[PDB]
Design a protein around this ligand. Structure first.
Ligand SMILES: *[C@@H]1O[C@H](CO)[C@@H](O[C@@H]2O[C@H](CO)[C@@H](O)[C@H](O)[C@H]2NC(C)=O)[C@H](O)[C@H]1NC(C)=O
Ligand SMILES: *[C@@H]1O[C@H](CO)[C@@H](O[C@@H]2O[C@H](CO)[C@@H](O)[C@H](O)[C@H]2NC(C)=O)[C@H](O)[C@H]1NC(C)=O
Ligand SMILES: *[C@@H]1O[C@H](CO[C@@H]2O[C@@H](C)[C@@H](O)[C@@H](O)[C@@H]2O)[C@@H](O)[C@H](O)[C@H]1NC(C)=O
Ligand SMILES: *[C@@H]1O[C@H](CO[C@@H]2O[C@@H](C)[C@@H](O)[C@@H](O)[C@@H]2O)[C@@H](O)[C@H](O)[C@H]1NC(C)=O
Ligand SMILES: *[C@@H]1O[C@H](CO)[C@@H](O)[C@H](O)[C@H]1NC(C)=O
Ligand SMILES: *[C@@H]1O[C@H](CO)[C@@H](O)[C@H](O)[C@H]1NC(C)=O
Ligand SMILES: *[C@@H]1O[C@H](CO)[C@@H](O)[C@H](O)[C@H]1NC(C)=O
Ligand SMILES: *[C@@H]1O[C@H](CO)[C@@H](O)[C@H](O)[C@H]1NC(C)=O
Ligand SMILES: *[C@@H]1O[C@H](CO)[C@@H](O)[C@H](O)[C@H]1NC(C)=O
Lengths: 475, 475
């Protein structure tokens, strides 16, 4: 054909991470009636101008190039916007070069946080004390946030700790300065410490279909030998998916049946102490999907009212965003564009400048989907659905001549007899000659009203005339 | 820190396509008792030897360097094999440099296949005829396989066609040679043509969780205006997800409820011709998951029988392969290693050589998963559960001296009185002096049997002796 609006051949894939210093080539593959132009956008900011270059090449990736990219295609018809593509860049910074200090009273839990370091993705850490690798045991844990946890600390736990971090994507590794941990011997060598949850499980929301999800719970008590950390769901202790001395519970292939509350509980076996409990909540995000899409192309008559359907579902409920030619309707500030609460678009009076691509985006916390349509608004020249015919009407009785025309917008109809005008939209005021929808009615009719009449229906595009002779018979 | 078998901190992620000439960094991030060593494998072939370097770096990635990579971690305890990672390289070759010719009779469908070109991934195409971009219409379609299909060809459709292919990953573009198409005018301009399916929909198997899938169906008829191609499933025409003049049916978020058969049908609206039909079948692959995993560490006594659980479900049913220290049990040809049909491992008699990591892999047509355990086979020194006690027994009656021990392997028990050995595993013959399991029974007992007795239990590790006095009373 010779009048095709743009449409994409292929949409962006899943987000991806790339190494610093590598070459990146984004492509914008769309088809449509020429001349096609492409503009590139990063983070809702225009990067390039429109050109015949559908590619975008970064010869050496930096960390600042990371973000969300998307392409815009445009020809004479309209503009279409590509879905987001998430380009991440792998980097790892350096530790602040200064030692730190921390003090813990004897028996309490010692929690050493990973010293600040910017890294993408999260680095894998290996903790060290006096040159010896610290491997987790019943008394030592390494939380998911790379924090070291020493349970039931004694005087022998004092010393200088440090960590060695490795970024699993670029292989870079950095060694931190020291954290000097000191233990105060005030609590005593012999006592009993009620179980206390040091690291509680947190609420989690998982996109439906993910491989696995993990929960953690660290607790402190003394004697640590008798400390038991267990997971309850639906009032029953769980046994499957447990890791790291019962401190980690993993849901493999989580589904809607796994949502709800999980309860971490720590008890000191054989003690009169009340247990420690912490609640966590698993929910699942359903990425959006359309239940109502508009047809690909939509024809419209001017001055008409248009409704473009767009409804989408998801968990949580998706949000709809309307664009016209890659411009959000919000910034267009067109008062005639009203967005229905269902999500559909409502256009009051169609004007020729409303032609172009309309786009609907459904967004969740875990997805985004797009639909679009081409709106074609054209003018219709006036035409006669039924022309007036010659008629004979008895004196004193009413007479009606029909002159029905179709046009966009509605043609202005003017009934005139020879050189004088009898009725119009502006003028329907003399001798009870009435203009009704589609025609003229004279009531009553004298012989002085006899003669031939002409109906002039005019539009912004053209004008048309229809003649018909009326003869008045004697009473 | 000693006594900790290896285990990975992170496993490889989903496959990604990389550009030619980019830097590639694979990491083998595992923790465990030092000294740790690492080896690298590509396609069942070692790349590196064992060393203290956990990284593998390709400064300039080439097409030939594509393949499957994995690392093996090893310390004094055993060896552990990482999940394979798929390294794909984006490339785009050229077309075979020669023109081709094709002929179609006026009214038939003309199917032009994309000329041969090797490219990863599959290139997007734009079709041209005499320097004009061919845009799909009701009469012209571009298949999912980049084929151009012209329905109801006329003499005005003859000419030289060519395609321009673009690789969406690296942006390269190549232009094919010419297909000189001629249209024979034998059948005639004035006639009707029955709907005939040209491009049939293909069977599709899709891994569960994929975004979308699409069947295509292209049919030819004349007049092409009256040709309607629609999709029926379960005897009902589908209205959701129709694309490109009804020729494309797209299942969005395909789940188990979407599997089965789909039927394409093409009719000439208002004709006495029978409709044309074509069946297609959609199935869904469920990646493997474990339903039974072994414990992280398993302690075992020598000469005993061991069973290691490994079950895994999925669609299709997964295949399970076993390894011992990164060596497949099939290659080991060990007769004491029997693989259960449920997937479990069965070890007949535990020998100290059986110590080390065992690793179960579950793989299907759409995934692979890993579980492992460390088997520690040790010897247990003999220890008395109950030593012999002083006893007084009436002459003629039976008597029992109890000497029960625990050890691995089973301690050989030798019952001796003074310098003479009354009973042993080798000798249990004399005077109905019988060796009960863990004890000595004299039946009957004469006055000559009085005195104190000693029990000698010995394994390969050590030997222990225990004595007790026996006094016989007169009848
Ligand atoms: C473009 O937007 C992305 C996403 O909002 C930004 O990426 C974030 O960067 C900040 C700091 O650099 C991090 O704390 C976030 O974790 C990143 N991701 C997200 C999802 O927020 C990126 O920085 C933006 N680029 C520019 C130039 O503003
Ligand atoms: C490693 O093996 C893989 C497959 O076992 C090879 O990749 C295949 O190569 C053949 C022919 O070169 C292609 O037809 C397949 O499409 C490839 N499959 C892929 C890429 O998944 C690979 O070439 C081997 N490695 C090396 C270095 O040759
Ligand atoms: C954790 O969530 C509780 C309930 O909130 C809802 O349910 C869980 C599954 C979450 O997914 C959350 O997004 C939902 O809104 C709250 O009662 C509780 O306060 C939350 N805890 C927090 C926010 O720290
Ligand atoms: C299409 O498939 C039919 C059924 O086979 C099953 O479904 C397909 C989708 C595959 O997943 C296959 O592994 C399954 O066994 C076949 O009976 C039929 O012959 C196939 N037809 C063609 C043209 O391949
Ligand atoms: C990275 O690891 C190596 C291996 O031990 C080590 O020698 C080197 O010091 C580490 N780099 C840093 C910056 O600590
Ligand atoms: C209407 O009047 C104009 C002007 O006289 C004339 O050109 C036109 O032909 C008339 N319409 C028809 C249908 O004849
Ligand atoms: C094809 O590639 C050439 C150079 O590689 C480039 O100049 C041109 O713009 C590309 N596109 C077309 C349509 O030729
Ligand atoms: C065992 O018997 C011998 C001789 O019959 C005797 O000398 C010895 O004291 C006895 N053992 C004990 C522990 O009395
Ligand atoms: C008997 O046991 C003792 C004590 O365990 C040990 O010293 C001795 O070597 C054993 N054997 C003999 C023959 O005394």
């Amino acid at each position: 054909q010779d009048d095709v609006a743009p449409y994409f051949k292929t949409e962006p894939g899943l987000p991806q991470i790339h190494l610093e210093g590598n070459r990146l080539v984004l492509t914008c593959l769309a088809e449509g009636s020429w001349p096609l132009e492409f503009k590139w956008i990063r983070n809702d900011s225009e990067l390039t101008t429109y050109s015949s270059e559908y590619k975008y090449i970064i010869p050496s990736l930096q960390k600042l190039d990371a973000g969300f990219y998307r392409c815009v295609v445009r020809n004479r018809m309209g503009a279409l916007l590509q879905r987001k593509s998430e380009i991440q860049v792998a980097y790892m910074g350096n530790f602040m070069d200064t030692d730190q200090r921390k003090t813990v009273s004897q028996g309490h839990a010692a929690l050493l946080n990973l010293l600040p370091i910017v890294s993408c993705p999260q680095p894998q850490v290996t903790w060290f004390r006096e040159g010896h690798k610290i491997i987790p045991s019943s008394r030592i844990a390494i939380t998911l946030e790379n924090q070291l946890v020493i349970l039931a600390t004694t005087a022998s736990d004092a010393g200088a700790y440090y960590v060695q971090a490795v970024n699993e994507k670029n292989g870079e590794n950095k060694t931190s300065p020291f954290i000097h941990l000191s233990v105060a011997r005030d609590t005593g060598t012999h006592e009993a410490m009620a179980p206390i949850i040091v690291v509680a499980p947190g609420n989690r929301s998982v996109v439906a279909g993910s491989s696995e999800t993990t929960l953690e719970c660290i607790a402190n008590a003394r004697p640590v030998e008798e400390l038991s950390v267990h997971w309850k769901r639906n009032g029953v202790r769980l046994t499957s998916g447990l890791h790291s001395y019962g401190r980690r519970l993993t849901i493999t292939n989580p589904t809607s049946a796994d949502t709800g509350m999980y309860v971490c509980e720590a008890t000191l076996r054989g003690s009169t102490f009340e247990p420690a409990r912490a609640r966590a909540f698993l929910s699942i995000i359903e990425p959006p999907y359309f239940t109502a899409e508009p047809e690909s192309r939509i024809l419209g008559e001017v001055e008409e009212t248009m409704d473009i359907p767009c409804r989408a579902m998801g968990v949580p409920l998706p949000t709809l965003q309307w664009y016209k030619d890659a411009v959000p309707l919000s910034k267009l500030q067109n008062p005639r564009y009203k967005v229905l609460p269902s999500g559909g678009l409502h256009i009051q009076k169609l004007s020729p400048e409303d032609s172009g691509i309309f786009q609907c985006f459904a967004s969740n916390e875990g997805g985004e989907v797009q639909t679009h349509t081409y709106l074609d608004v054209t003018n219709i020249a006036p035409a006669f659905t039924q022309r007036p015919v010659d008629t004979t009407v008895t004196d004193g009785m009413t007479a009606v001549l029909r002159c029905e025309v179709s046009g966009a917008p509605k043609p202005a109809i003017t009934w005139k007899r020879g050189n004088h005008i009898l009725a119009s939209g502006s003028v329907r005021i003399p001798r009870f000659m009435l203009l009704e929808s589609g025609g003229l009615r004279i009531a009553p009719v004298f012989i002085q009203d006899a003669g031939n009449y002409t109906c002039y229906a005019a539009n912004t595009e053209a004008s048309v005339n229809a003649s018909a002779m009326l003869t008045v018979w004697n009473r």
